[PDB]
């Protein structure tokens, strides 16, 4: 009754449909994970962490800049 | 000034970032007895991070602690209020006072058989400890002094240190249950002497806090190693009055600890008895109740 017998060609098309569905399902899942709120908060936080380190590093290394530029102004 | 009268002020100043680098600093030569009287101060001064400052310093909290050290620590009117003073009068009246009332150790112990209740004859009421009360007032050194500071914190409701003495030590499942029933118990005599009911509010809150900690230590220990959690729940608590964690949790009436899966499948094992059968129960065993010969066809264990 419901066991519709099916020949090879159609079987390649139902296989192609099914593989396209599995790949698009995992695509719709990983952008649900990557646009959900928690993940946005988690990434923004870790980004801010690296920002804190580096921006402080730019502060201290520019301090070395402003000392060196003032010393270069002393030599002229 | 010198370091002995430096920390007097620093412990009074309650600044964790002053004597962490100063007061005690490489090059300072500390005298003798000054730190140990500063612990006798600090425990009463409700010093949460300052006691742990002096532990990281290396006050051997073992060697510091003597018999009359805990006594001196109980006879102090500093810190928060003591429900202790209402009890020391309740349990002495149960046995048979000016502010000079000496809070005898066996009375803190009597408070124990009254509050914790049940059998639970404490280690202090030991005739062996009873002869050292008259013979002293390394005998003063305690075997596991951690435990007697655990009872010390919870009697005078000092909860910040009561959580601090709990990550440091041993038998932590036991101390969680002993403190939990004991603080449900002070929540009974605080209503009995009709003290200000806000203590009963936060001692029901503290009793339930030790109550969750017994549970999240239990389901924690479950997923580490289940078979060895059996040995923890059953073994004899020689220090805590020769008892057992299930025997103290039903004493606590801490329902949720009894209901967590670990203690339940222990209870099923004992209900099954020396039997491995564990399949179509009730009907197979009732055939053995009436008919003898079915017994041979059951799987026992050893």
């Amino acid at each position: 009754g419901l066991k519709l017998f099916i020949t090879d060609d159609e079987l390649k098309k139902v296989h192609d449909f099914e593989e396209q569905c599995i790949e698009e399902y995992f695509r719709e899942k990983d952008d649900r994970f990557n646009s959900s709120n928690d993940e946005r908060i988690r990434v923004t936080s870790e980004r801010v962490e690296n920002m804190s380190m580096r921006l402080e590093e730019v502060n201290e290394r520019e301090h070395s800049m402003k000392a060196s530029l003032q010393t270069v102004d002393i030599r002229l | 000034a010198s370091a002995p009268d430096q920390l007097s002020l620093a412990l009074a100043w309650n600044r964790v970032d002053i004597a962490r680098s100063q007061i005690f600093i490489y090059g300072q030569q500390w005298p003798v007895g000054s730190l140990e009287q500063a612990m006798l101060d600090a425990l009463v001064l409700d010093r949460v991070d300052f006691v742990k400052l002096l532990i990281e310093n290396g006050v051997s909290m073992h060697r510091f602690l003597t018999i009359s050290r805990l006594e001196e620590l109980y006879n102090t009117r500093h810190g928060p209020s003591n429900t202790l003073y209402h009890l020391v009068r309740d349990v002495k009246k149960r046995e048979y006072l000016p502010p000079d009332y000496r809070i005898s150790l066996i009375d803190i112990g009597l408070v124990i058989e009254y509050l914790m209740g049940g059998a639970y004859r404490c280690n202090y009421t030991r005739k062996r400890f009873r002869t050292l009360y008259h013979n002293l007032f390394e005998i003063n050194h305690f075997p596991f002094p951690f435990h007697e500071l655990m009872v010390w914190a919870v009697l005078m409701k000092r909860q910040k240190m009561a959580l601090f003495f709990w990550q440091h030590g041993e038998e932590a499942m036991a101390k969680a249950l002993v403190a939990c029933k004991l603080c449900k118990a002070m929540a009974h005599e605080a209503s009995e002497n009709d003290m200000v009911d806000d203590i009963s509010q936060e001692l029901n809150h503290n009793s339930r806090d030790f109550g969750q900690l017994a549970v999240e230590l239990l389901d924690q220990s479950y997923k580490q190693d289940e078979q060895l959690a059996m040995k923890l729940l059953t073994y004899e608590l020689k220090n805590w009055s020769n008892a057992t964690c299930l025997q103290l949790a039903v004493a606590a009436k801490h329902r949720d600890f009894i209901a967590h899966t670990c203690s339940q499948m222990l209870l099923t094992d004992m209900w099954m008895g020396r039997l491995r059968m564990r399949k179509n129960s009730g009907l197979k065993v009732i055939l053995g109740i009436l008919l003898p010969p079915s017994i041979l066809s059951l799987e026992f264990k050893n």
């Binding site: 962490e49 380190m53 590093e57 | 490489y26 090059g27 990281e56 310093n57 290396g58």
Partner: protein
């Protein structure tokens, strides 16, 4: 000899030790570290090197370095093989072990520079030891929270160099026997260089020019010899071909970070070209992932 019981310094731990003359037989030290000390043979040795002076780095450089060395020691069950006294890189690996704890750490120190020499006497006896470290005396206490120790007098006080040859020959000895996996290698000795000075260039030359070719890992972001090895490493192309503009930038950071003279910088640059000939056996960890990948990449490379 005996057991060192620490008062102060955080958690109380017992780090048992011995006193060693600096030319003992290392085979009897292997019998020692299998029987009397009773340590199992590992499948990784890190040999952490740096300047003898104290220093400070960037904060999550400390976090990455602190996590990675002990996380390597957890993924391999490694024997970390340190320089003993509580200065610089060895204070940093002390902070690294303080960051996790929860391992098999061994330090070798000179008895002539450790503070409280006469306090440190015993015969198989538990001795209370202090973390008392006077800045007035030049004697520096050993690193506290390790688990194994060898205090090694050369007779004099206040100098280095008597433990470098002992360290070299002891890890040579430990690499000579067959490893527990026993496929045709020793324990993979791998040499971590955080910063380091002029001597660590000759120690990495003693590591590279060696059978087996010791896989070394250098650490970037730390300073001094490590950044000039990094400058010869990123701008390297086909190995030793290095031009003159970054040579003079390197020579003024040898004349400012090292404060050498012009001829000392040129001499050390000759040594630098001799070391920059071998770029494949060095592995340049850079900041930007931990020193896990660095140490285990070098592990496999020198596992051979």
């Amino acid at each position: 000899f005996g057991t060192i019981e620490f008062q102060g310094g955080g958690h109380s731990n017992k780090a048992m030790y011995v006193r060693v003359s600096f030319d003992t037989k290392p085979d009897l030290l292997l019998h020692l570290m299998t029987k009397e000390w009773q340590l199992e043979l590992p499948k990784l040795l890190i040999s952490v090197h740096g300047g003898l002076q104290n220093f400070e780095l960037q904060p999550k450089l400390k976090q990455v370095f602190g996590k990675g060395l002990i996380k390597a020691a957890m993924t391999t069950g490694a024997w970390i093989f340190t320089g003993g006294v509580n200065t610089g890189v060895i204070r940093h690996v002390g902070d690294a072990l303080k960051d996790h704890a929860s391992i098999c750490t061994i330090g070798i120190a000179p008895w002539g520079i450790v503070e409280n020499q006469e306090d440190l006497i015993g015969r198989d006896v538990v001795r209370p030891y202090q973390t008392m470290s006077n800045p007035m005396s030049k004697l520096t206490v050993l690193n506290s929270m390790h688990s194994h120790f060898i205090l090694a007098d050369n007779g004099t006080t206040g100098k280095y160099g008597a433990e470098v040859k002992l360290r070299r020959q002891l890890e040579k000895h430990i690499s000579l026997q067959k490893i527990n996996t026993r496929i045709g290698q020793g324990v993979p000795v791998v040499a971590l260089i955080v910063e380091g000075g002029p001597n660590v260039i000759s120690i990495v030359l003693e590591y590279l020019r060696d059978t087996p070719p010791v896989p070394v890992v250098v650490c970037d972001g730390s300073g001094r010899a490590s950044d000039i090895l990094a400058f010869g490493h990123k701008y390297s192309e086909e190995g030793g071909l290095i031009n003159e503009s970054l040579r003079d930038q390197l020579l003024v950071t040898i004349q400012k970070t090292f404060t050498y003279t012009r001829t000392q910088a040129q001499h050390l640059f000759i040594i630098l070209m001799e070391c920059m000939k071998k770029k494949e056996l060095i592995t340049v960890f850079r900041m930007g992932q931990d020193i896990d990948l660095a140490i285990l990449t070098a592990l496999l490379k020198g596992a051979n």
